[PDB]
Design a protein around this ligand. Structure first.
Ligand code: HEC
Ligand code: HEC
Lengths: 108, 108
């Protein structure tokens, strides 16, 4: 929509340096600070099982699609006020396109 | 000196998206637009054999060291006026640290 495909390899590294500390993407992957992200796109916010989400996350009932994920990736707390994700944000569209491209591919 | 180690994987991708179009790093790698970069660090500018450099490059007789490479990576034409490298430049220190870290490792 207002999301353009980017570098999958570029995104894989962004993930390692900004997301891996708290999340996993593989199927059969374990939750850590952050919930496992396999099958995220199309799922609504706060539905992974065996993971303890904030009230904030649950109640947004965000349908993850490349578009929304881009909003959220800019500034998680402004997007979902109350959330415990301590990620400052990805101000760069290019950075986000790359990431979501990556996520798009490795979370399926 | 004024160069700090960064992400090798992060740098590998930067290379793919901004350098691979014209250069190779592997030993036994071929020149393309750009010369093969194996063994670059410690070599002086314009000495790869069988590659056609500008007068500009030769005459700088730049000793490649992480430091110099960082200068050059910011703005090649301002650094070596006359050069045919059509790279706008890496204005980001973080981007450059990552790249040189990468280069440092894969050109040896
Ligand atoms: C720890 C410092 C984190 C880092 C770095 C990143 N995330 Fe995160 N994430 C974290 C927590 C604690 C939570 C849950 C918040 C809550 O209120 O319960 C999250 C949540 C997400 C989600 C939503 C999950 C869902 O609804 O199933 C997404 C899509 C997500 N995180 C993605 C994500 C990406 C892509 C990151 C890297 C730039 C990233 N997070 C960083 C903790 C941490
Ligand atoms: C084609 C569009 C290029 C891209 C993209 C990059 N480089 Fe380049 N490089 C290119 C040329 C044509 C030349 C030679 C210029 C001349 O005057 O003859 C170069 C040269 C270099 C050098 C110096 C080589 C030496 O002295 O042996 C270096 C260190 C170098 N290039 C590195 C480099 C990196 C790290 C790049 C990605 C950010 C990059 N180049 C992009 C052509 C092209």
């Amino acid at each position: 929509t207002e999301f353009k495909a980017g570098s999958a390899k570029k995104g894989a590294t962004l993930f390692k340096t900004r997301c891996l500390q708290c999340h996993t993407v593989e199927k059969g992957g374990p939750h850590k600070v952050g919930p496992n992200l396999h099958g995220i796109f199309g799922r609504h916010s706060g539905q992974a099982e065996g993971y303890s989400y904030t009230d904030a996350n649950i109640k947004k009932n965000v349908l993850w699609d490349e578009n929304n994920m881009s909003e959220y990736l800019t500034n998680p707390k402004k997007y979902i006020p109350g959330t415990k994700m301590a990620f400052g944000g990805a101000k760069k569209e290019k950075d986000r396109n790359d990431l979501i491209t990556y996520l798009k591919k490795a979370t399926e």
